[PDB]
Design a binder for this molecule. Structure first.
Ligand code: FMN
Ligand code: FMN
Lengths: 174, 174
């Protein structure tokens, strides 16, 4: 079961990239996770699209088409998903045969304050559902106070979190 | 009264851009609309921001700070606002003293086909309130079937949408 991990944050220390990094070692037997790189994807511009998909967008789209399932790690930016993550989905959603169609997915999000991700995870869920994606309803995974939830070398300390992801990955495998 | 028009679309024929332009031909005395340019704003990345605002973002934040009101024309992509617009908002919202705070703003959205922008407008309204913007609730301005609503090189053929822009600009002045 090839699972594609998608972070909505480009920063090297990104707690969201970190959580998907930890999910690699939390997968169950039979499943495996590979992180997608969207740093190369540009700002959406219909004119550019008309001329054809940017190299970085073709690679991404084909990673989605090929993966058996998707795992999203969306940060919340101002009461919604991060623009960057949305922008990448925008590109990837263009005809013909946008690869999202039919794929199952799991959503989780990391924020640093005391809330976050609740609104971004909902918006992301609706956006994905709009593209015919079938996301897992539960469990619900949110990493609050992430700045304390991880250490320098990006490692998740909360057993609850480690366990929740394991749960989701299984719930995903089913 | 200086007003900032922000289009969430970068394509040359953008109906959301074309709509704001029309509004310029509709301003009443004592009000002027200038169109911000976000095309130069890069994808958001915390590591880049840590070293200072890109010039484009800088130019953008100051226009917001200086303008007495904001006029947003957001297209709707995949059940939410355009990723491009959200990214510009993400960049502009960073401390120190992000300029959205306090500014009154009005929303409108241009889309082709069936529905459009109703979700994007909601998310946008929400995100902006989160930044302490005072967006107007009435009137709702949705330009549907935009592909027919506009002719070659601008000009809003639909008289209905015209009334709303006018009304929206008048309410805004108040
Ligand atoms: C433009 C921007 C908007 C943000 N908005 C919110 C927000 O609405 N709520 C919240 O709890 N945190 C918010 N944050 C903080 C992020 O959740 C926090 O910095 C997080 O560590 C980012 O993780 P990532 O780098 O893994 O994406 C925002 C950060 C930025 C740069
Ligand atoms: C990611 C994406 C999703 C879109 N989804 C729809 C849709 O569901 N229904 C529809 O009628 N048009 C849809 N459109 C078309 C736009 O509404 C149309 O191209 C519009 O004219 C763009 O206006 P703008 O250039 O002012 O943003 C979509 C466009 C993009 C880029």
């Amino acid at each position: 079961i090839k699972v594609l991990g998608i972070s909505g944050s480009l920063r090297s220390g990104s707690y969201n990239s970190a959580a998907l990094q930890e999910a690699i070692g939390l997968v169950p037997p039979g499943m495996s996770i590979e992180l997608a790189d969207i740093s190369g994807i540009p700002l959406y511009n219909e004119d550019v699209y008309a001329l054809g998909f940017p190299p970085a967008v073709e690679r991404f789209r084909e990673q989605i088409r090929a993966a058996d399932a998707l795992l999203f790690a969306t940060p919340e930016y101002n009461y919604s998903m991060a623009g960057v993550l949305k922008n990448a989905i925008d590109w990837a959603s263009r005809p013909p045969e946008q690869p999202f169609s039919g794929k199952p997915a799991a959503i989780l999000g990391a924020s640093a304050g005391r809330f976050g991700t609740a609104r971004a995870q909902y918006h992301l869920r609706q956006t994905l559902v709009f593209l015919d994606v079938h996301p897992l309803n539960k469990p619900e995974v949110m990493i609050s106070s992430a700045q304390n939830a991880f250490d320098a070398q990006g490692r998740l300390l909360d057993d609850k979190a480690r366990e929740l992801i394991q749960q989701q990955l299984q719930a995903l495998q089913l």
